[PDB]
Every structure is written in C-alpha cells, then in structure tokens.
Design a protein around this ligand. Structure first.
Ligand SMILES: *[C@@H]1O[C@H](CO)[C@@H](O)[C@H](O)[C@H]1NC(C)=O
Ligand SMILES: *[C@@H]1O[C@H](CO)[C@@H](O)[C@H](O)[C@H]1NC(C)=O
Lengths: 101, 101
C-alpha cells in the first residue's frame, strides 16, 4: 500500500510473547509456525489498518504458534554453509547477543 | 506408536490451569468438555510429537473447555453405585485428598 491520506497499517504483538520483526533479534524456539488461517494453541497478531489513529480495522491477522527450546533462531540477515561468523566490536560500547545472552 | 529411534510424543498443558493426566487427582469442575475440533473460550493442549527433543511438531491438539464449580470430579480409577469408599492410612505419612482439600 501507499501512505495515501491518514491511512496506516502494521502487525501488532496481539497476545504473543514476541513481535513480528522483533523475532529477528536472536529470539529462539524449538519449533515455530505461521498461518493466515487459525492454528491451535497459537497467539494471534492483528494485521491492523487504521485511519488517523482514530478508526481501526483488523484487515487480517497472522496466527503464530511455537515450542520453546532452540535449534530455531530468528536473525537479522542471511547466512550460509557450515562455517559461522563471530562479529565483535572491541573497546566501544556495543549492543551484544553472545551465545544467546 | 512405538518409541522407534529418538521419536517421542505427549500432551502438554498448553495454556490450561491443569494438565491431561493430572486432572485424575481430584480436580473439580461445574462442567468440562473436550474436542479434537476447536471449541470457544477453551484452552488448547498441544499433542506434540518430537524427534531428539530437537525438532517438534503439533501432530494435533486437544481443545478443552470448562466451568469452575463442582459436581464433576476427575479421579484415578473406577467407581460404582450409591455407596462411596473412604480410604485412609492411619499413623503413617500420607498424601491426602480429604473433602476436596
Ligand atoms: C558485523 O556487523 C556489521 C553491522 O553492520 C556489519 O556491517 C559487518 O559486515 C559485520 N561483520 C561481519 C564479519 O559480518
Ligand atoms: C486404598 O488405596 C490403595 C492404593 O493402592 C488401594 O490399594 C486400596 O485397595 C484402597 N482401599 C480401598 C478400600 O479402596
């Protein structure tokens, strides 16, 4: 969509213990699955359009379901192969995600 | 199923204030109902298969719904008729469920 007039749209957390987008920050799961048709035990994130922050419509929702644990990690950008990078900024104040801390 | 390879499966509490199996411990309801198709206001317990505790699949879910109150009790084993047993172990430390305490 275009930002025509005072229209806006977004995902919202809805009732999940994470947000769409924010799961790119090294959030971990034993298994995670998404749908545009409802899925059992899963939380739902409303795809909300609104006009002027004054009228709001759930133009759809995203249904998301997961196991806690790990083996699945959400990440900022692409990765390849067996070899894995370590990226570190020495001696400068830094925001870090080190061995899932 | 057989425990072939590292496969396992279970019910989990999901989002319920009880577990399947554990409701056999004298848990009480005004009404309770179960389904394999979704039911309104009810919590859902995921029927999870997993491999090696490392990949997990909701092979189904159990949907469960209830009223609080009583007249329905979950119990360990069968019962019959109008007459009801009292089973007590005097003078030895014991785990008890006495008049729903
Ligand atoms: C480390 O992260 C920064 C963030 O932009 C990126 O520019 C850089 O390419 C990364 N280094 C490696 C080795 O991936
Ligand atoms: C009392 O509970 C024990 C637990 O195993 C059982 O073996 C016994 O038969 C019970 N007694 C009665 C009267 O049901």
């Amino acid at each position: 969509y275009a930002n025509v007039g005072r229209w806006s749209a977004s995902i919202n957390t809805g009732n999940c213990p994470f947000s769409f987008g924010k799961v790119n920050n090294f959030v971990k799961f034993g298994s995670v699955c998404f749908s545009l048709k409802d899925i059992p035990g899963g939380c739902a994130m409303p795809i909300v359009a609104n006009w002027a922050y004054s009228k709001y419509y759930t133009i759809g929702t995203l249904y998301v379901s997961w196991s806690d644990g790990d083996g699945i990690t959400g990440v900022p950008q692409p990765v390849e192969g067996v070899s894995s990078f370590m990226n570190v900024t020495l001696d400068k104040c830094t925001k870090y995600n080190i061995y899932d801390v």
